[PDB]
Scaffold this active site. Structure first.
Site: not given
Ligand SMILES: CC(=O)N[C@H]1NC[C@H](CO)[C@H](O)[C@@H]1O
Ligand SMILES: *[C@@H]1O[C@H](CO)[C@@H](O[C@@H]2O[C@H](CO)[C@@H](O)[C@H](O)[C@H]2NC(C)=O)[C@H](O)[C@H]1NC(C)=O
Ligand SMILES: *[C@@H]1O[C@H](CO)[C@@H](O[C@@H]2O[C@H](CO)[C@@H](O)[C@H](O)[C@H]2NC(C)=O)[C@H](O)[C@H]1NC(C)=O
Ligand SMILES: CC(=O)N[C@H]1NC[C@H](CO)[C@H](O)[C@@H]1O
Lengths: 480, 480
Positions: A283
């Site tokens: 992200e």
């Molecule tokens: C690798 C990953 O999963 N990154 C984010 N994505 C969504 C998650 C919540 O479901 C967390 O915020 C996490 O940090």
């Protein structure tokens, strides 16, 4: 009431009894391990407590090869064992200590009390070994700090479920509880408070407690995104934003960044004995990089144009190189792979996005990279009802690819992100939902009968409660 | 950090201090209550503990009318109060004991410790009274037995949130933990085990503990459906099914049924002092009645044809009559109303179905019946994220109707059905999600600022944790 269900279980109707103060677990005379083996001695004692809390007088434990008693487990550790339950002496045989640990858990699941309180066990033969070698739980200690005691409890529950990797997502945007020796200001300024910190001794305690249960501690220090807390203590690390928020991802144009990361990861290579370090890479937000004039100058300096994936790739490649130079392996979230970073052979990719994950699994493996699946096992994403069944029904190798590609699938993780989780609710949320993933990752592909899974899991869950793990119900009912 | 937000709060910048061993809560000389008032004396002591755990030396509590100290609360109980925080003596004034209890909670939420640990409170004036008089929590002790201690904890959390009704869904299909004196076999044969039972003394303890906090205990003994456990101990009560399951709803053609229910509810009228008994009436399945030859004969005997709603109506009308004869009021789930049962004036209808609930609220009130809303507050239906906000945003009086119809809306309940809930997970699931409903039911209609709600609720939640209620997080962060 076995969970996960062993590869091969064969029982007879012959019942044998056990006497709590006349039942000993000890080393077989031919074993490579003995009283010096702390790991086995401590396991013998805690399993004696779990078991009790025509007579089988003794359980002899035979380690066949060099025991690896004083070593840390790794991805290739042999967790195979056989268990022969008979009178007067039952025998647990394993190539290594790792298999004996697994077998002690299985043995404890075979002993039960009849209607009159008599400790009983069926004569039986079990042959067992895991379907996948990477069987993880992700915990998040940044979104909320987790006291060391609940991490230790999680490790105990992991052992009961034969999980073997603690993916410690230790730091993130909201807080930096990792106390770094070389960089004291990271935690001093980035923690929620000075009592919400993992000291060097806290970290060693977790690692060792995990080791004693055959569990690897996989540290994740996510960059370049998910680093807001890092900027409090390391000045000039983060990119200042011109405008939406205040600071964005780590600034990948500065030599001070890579100098900082070199010193930082060198410390991590020394603190965490596991072969792998998870570098994150998920992200990453480009707007901040896009809005920064100095970054724009750097972008044109080597022809990246307006493609910030190339800047992310440039950054991540320099970190991967730092890890290789200190002789550790790297794990990365899929974005690093999806955004076209050049990854060295052996780099593990963790597939977490739920959108077309089977197609992601094919791409990663077709490119020759080992893969770990977490996508359908985001346990933070709660919902009404028996969602354990949906985690259980996943068949991870249902993706397009040759046998060679399918051999690159090394396992998976159940992920419990921390936005809505802390000590008040972690355990009931985690268990027994994670037990569903544990069986899918340990047991044979053809172990999928839903009625039998419900029958064994409700009892396994009651067993977790009896051992002090507050695992939540599957449905209406009671324990005892 | 007030929760629920009082009707009217006016503060000055003048800070006043409190000294833990020189701060007393006592009866004002003109109060109608004194040392004989157990309810107030116990509240003074526990709030002293909660508070601490230029000087305001004392909090004087003045009850203006007959205190009702030795009575049970009811739907019309006056929970209004005023609180004047000033030096040297603050004053809490209330018509009755019920308001003083509410005011003691508010007073405890005003006291805080500054950065140096100094106990501090702002000079202030609060005027407060609830928007609705029925503010309930439904607990389900049939789908899973709940130990008495967690019921007492729930009552403590209810008091912190100004909830005033415990809707005890005590029995259901899966188990019958209510130990009946007149019918010992109901629990002996219907409980999960003999240690999963509420003895007459357990029930009195819950009722009294609730009374001491201004909380009514509303018993629900759901019939004719949801009664499978009842059939174990009361032979010939349930309808035998010819074929899908084995036994269906209570058999409404037999005189032994009504004879049993008369004796049973007479005992309930004596055990539970609340004016109301919840008779249930939800989700009655007709297939079993349809497949039964003796019921078919009864159906034609009074011209009900093939309309089993008339048989359900016939049954429920006979139970409602039994309740009226013993001088109690009745509450009923909406199905009883929807299936055209003739309900006597004063019968409360609880609207729980999420499908077009505002239109249900209009129909019930247009028919002249008092209504309670639970439909959008089914807290057992968990989901990812900040679902507290959706519970908070409900405006219950947004349905079509005149002011007369809107005056028939007496309140609501947050419902925690028990299929997936027991002692391991009840509290974190309940709180602070139920706090959202608590404010919507206590505070003014125009109290809806989301940012302010988040700010006050995260701190209220930390306060719950400090007092031993393991309320879960709203989002990332920490307490202290
Ligand atoms: C690798 C990953 O999963 N990154 C984010 N994505 C969504 C998650 C919540 O479901 C967390 O915020 C996490 O940090
Ligand atoms: C473990 O041993 C017990 C006792 O022999 C087995 O239990 C019974 O099975 C026999 C015949 O298979 C039945 O006659 C009994 O009714 C069963 N229970 C009792 C009370 O003895 C049990 O099946 C064995 N476990 C397995 C899976 O082999
Ligand atoms: C309660 O009293 C305090 C102290 O007077 C109020 O706090 C401050 O408000 C003043 C002026 O309004 C500011 O100058 C200060 O910076 C504020 N804090 C401090 C450290 O004094 C507080 O506002 C009062 N509470 C309310 C809502 O009236
Ligand atoms: C009045 C009522 O709600 N009846 C049932 N409806 C669904 C619930 C689960 O959400 C419980 O099963 C409950 O017993």
């Amino acid at each position: 009431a076995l969970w996960p269900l062993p590869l091969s279980v064969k029982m007879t109707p012959n019942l044998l009894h056990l006497a709590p103060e006349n039942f000993y677990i000890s080393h077989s005379p031919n074993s490579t391990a003995g009283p010096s083996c702390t790991l086995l001695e401590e396991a013998f004692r805690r399993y004696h407590g779990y078991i009790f809390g025509t007579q089988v007088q003794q359980l002899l434990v035979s380690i066949t090869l060099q025991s690896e008693c004083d070593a840390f487990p790794n991805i290739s550790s042999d967790e195979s064992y056989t268990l022969l339950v008979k009178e007067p002496v039952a025998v647990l045989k394993a190539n290594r200590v790792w298999g004996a640990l697994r077998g002690l858990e299985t043995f404890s699941q075979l002993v039960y009390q009849d209607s009159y309180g008599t400790f009983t066990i069926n004569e039986s033969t079990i042959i067992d070994s895991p379907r996948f070698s990477h069987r993880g739980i992700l915990i998040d200690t940044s979104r909320h700090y987790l006291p060391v005691k609940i991490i230790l409890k999680t490790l105990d529950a992991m052992a009961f479920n034969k999980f073997n990797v603690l993916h410690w997502h230790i730091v993130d945007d909201q807080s930096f509880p990792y106390q770094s020796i070389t960089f004291p200001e990271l935690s001093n300024k980035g923690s929620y408070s000075l009592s919400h910190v993992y000291t060097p001794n806290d970290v060693r305690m977790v690692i060792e407690y995990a080791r004693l249960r055959g569990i690897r501690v996989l540290p994740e220090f996510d960059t370049p995104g998910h680093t807001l807390s890092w900027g409090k203590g390391q000045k000039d690390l983060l990119t200042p934003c011109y405008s939406l928020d205040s600071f964005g991802p780590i600034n990948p144009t500065l030599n001070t960044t890579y100098s900082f990361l070199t010193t930082f990861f060198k410390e991590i290579s020394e603190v965490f004995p596991d072969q792998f370090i998870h570098l994150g890479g998920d992200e990453v937000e480009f707007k901040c990089w896009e809005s920064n004039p100095k970054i724009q100058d750097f972008m044109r300096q080597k022809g990246f144009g307006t493609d910030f994936k190339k800047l992310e790739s440039f950054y991540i490649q320099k970190v991967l190189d730092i890890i290789a130079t200190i002789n550790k392996g790297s794990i990365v979230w899929q974005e690093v792979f999806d955004d076209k970073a050049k990854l060295a052979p052996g780099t593990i990719v963790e597939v977490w996005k739920d959108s077309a994950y089977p197609e992601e699994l094919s791409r990663v493996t077709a490119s020759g990279f080992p893969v770990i699946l977490s996508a359908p096992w985001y346990l933070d994403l709660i919902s009404y009802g028996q969602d354990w069944r949906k985690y259980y029904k996943v068949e991870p190798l249902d993706f397009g690819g040759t046998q060679k590609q399918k051999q690159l699938f090394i396992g998976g993780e159940a992920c419990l992100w921390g936005e809505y989780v802390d000590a008040t609710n972690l355990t009931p949320r985690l268990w027994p939902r994670a037990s569903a993933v544990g069986e899918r990752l340990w047991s044979s592909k053809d172990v999928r009968d839903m009625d039998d899974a419900y029958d064994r899991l409700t009892r396994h869950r009651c067993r977790m409660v009896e051992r002090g793990i507050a695992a939540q119900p599957l449905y209406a009912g009671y324990c005892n």
